[PDB]
A = this chain, B = another copy of it.
Amino acid sequence: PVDVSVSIFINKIYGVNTLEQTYKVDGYIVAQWTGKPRKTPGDKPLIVENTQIERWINNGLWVPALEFINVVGSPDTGNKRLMLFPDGRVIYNARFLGSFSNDMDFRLFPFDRQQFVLELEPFSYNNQQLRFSDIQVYTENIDNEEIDEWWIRGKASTHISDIRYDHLSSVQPNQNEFSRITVRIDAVRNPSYYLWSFILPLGLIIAASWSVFWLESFSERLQTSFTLMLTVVAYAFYTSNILGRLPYTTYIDQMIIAGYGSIFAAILLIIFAHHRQANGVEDDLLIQRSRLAFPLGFLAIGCVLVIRFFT
């Protein structure tokens, strides 16, 4: 095979769409291999711009078609240069811009760790004809940087693996294993916006529904409760606008469901108290003092939900 050394420079990561779990990566790819020696005007390396690589390929020069595996749509290719050397080494540099997809797990939604994956692979040549010798990813432009709500933590881990393709087994009998480069850039979500923007109003709503226990009249303890209940219920599709329609519950929507149960338990408790308060004064010392025992219960539920993340 031929040894192709790749350098991926990530200019920027933007447009991290969690609805379809895609992220737009812009950058440059530099694939360098060695071939037969050639003659150039002078002895400098010859630069062939875009549109002219086709003329050199029609002349007979071997240029591999490296593709992105985890891309959504076709990648936008900007300029591409082909830099040839007198000693015989060929360099193919190209600006890629692609919507790449990765399987993202949102079970811890505000406090979230994901990774952006770039999968690069020869389209035609298996590792018996093209082997990726090494890759260094030069992600210094976004190495420690918040893009929209994602901090980029750590370095980009680079792996070179080999993927067996069963669909090419009939057309290539015993050589269908393709060299592949995987670039992982770990990202940690910034939970600050959800903290001041959704956790805080829902916290004031839940605290206000704690406060409706401290009232004396039944005309205000049930109507308010119902207004606060339906206000929490209206927040059901908050994460489905940010994330997809996920089968699991995040932390935000579990807090919303805890709000459902809290206001519903409050409503049922107060309705039961007024129903047993029919045939007289009918006042017990326990229910009137349950105004302070209910926020403690919600705090215990919140703590036992956090403690799973804490361990």
Bin the interface of chain A by size: 35 or more
Tell me, in angstroms, the Cα distance from A224 to B221 when the chains sit together.
Answer: 12
**Residue in B97, B197, B208, B264 whose beta carbon sits within 8 Å of that of A253 in the complex:** B197
Partner of A214, one of B32, B76, B226, B271: B271
The yes or no answer to A160 lying at the interface (CB within 8 A) is no
The answer to the question of A167 belonging to the interface, with a C-beta cut-off of 8 Å to chain B, is yes
Task: Indicate if the CB atoms of B257 and A196 lie closer than 8 Å.
Answer: yes
Q: A148 at interface (Cβ–Cβ under 8 A)?
A: yes
Stretch at the interface among A180-188, A228-236, A299-307: A228-236
Contacting pair A226 B229 (CB below 8 A): no
Known: A149-B244, A236-B201, A245-B193. A124 touches B81 (CB 8 A): yes
Provide the residues of chain B in CB contact with A166, threshold 8 Å: 9, 138, 140
Nearest chain B CB to A284's CB is how many angstroms away?
A: 18
Q: Are B79 and A123 in contact (CB under 8 A)?
A: yes
**Interface assignment of A170: CB less than 8 Å from any CB of chain B:** yes
A196 touching B140, Cβ below 8 Å: no
Q: Decide yes or no whether A93 CB sits under 8 A from chain B.
A: yes
A56-95 with Cβ < 8 A to chain B: 57-58, 63-65, 67, 69, 72-74, 76-79, 81, 83, 91, 93, 95
Decide yes or no whether A174 CB sits under 8 A from chain B: no
Interchain CA distance A247-B20 in the complex, whole Å: 22
Q: Are A12 and B101 in contact (CB under 8 A)?
A: yes
Q: Across the interface, do A50 and B65 meet the contact criterion of CB distance under 8 Å?
A: yes
Q: Which B residues are in CB contact (< 8 Å) with A74?
A: 76-78, 97
Q: How many copies does the complex hold?
A: 5
Q: List residues of A whose CB falls within 8 A of some B CB.
A: 5, 7-9, 11-12, 14-15, 20, 24, 26, 28, 30, 32, 47, 49-52, 54-55, 57-58, 63-65, 67, 69, 72-74, 76-79, 81, 83, 91, 93, 95, 97, 101, 123-125, 136, 138, 140, 146, 148-149, 165-168, 170-171, 190, 192-194, 196-198, 200-201, 204-205, 207-208, 211, 214-220, 222-224, 226-231, 233, 236-237, 240, 242, 244-249, 253, 257, 260, 264, 267-268, 271-272, 274-275, 278
Complex Cα–Cα for A111 and B51 (A): 47
Give the most central of A67, A205, A208: most B CB within 10 Å.
A208
Given the interface contacts A171-B83, A211-B267, A224-B226, does A193 sit within 8 Å of B247 by beta carbon?
A: yes
A204–B264 contact, CB under 8 A? yes
- When distances are taken between beta carbons in the complex, the residues of chain B under 8 Å from A97 are 73-74
A–B Cβ pairs within 8 angstroms, 14 of them: A81-B124, A83-B124, A138-B166, A197-B245, A200-B260, A204-B229, A205-B233, A214-B271, A215-B271, A216-B275, A218-B220, A219-B219, A226-B227, A242-B245
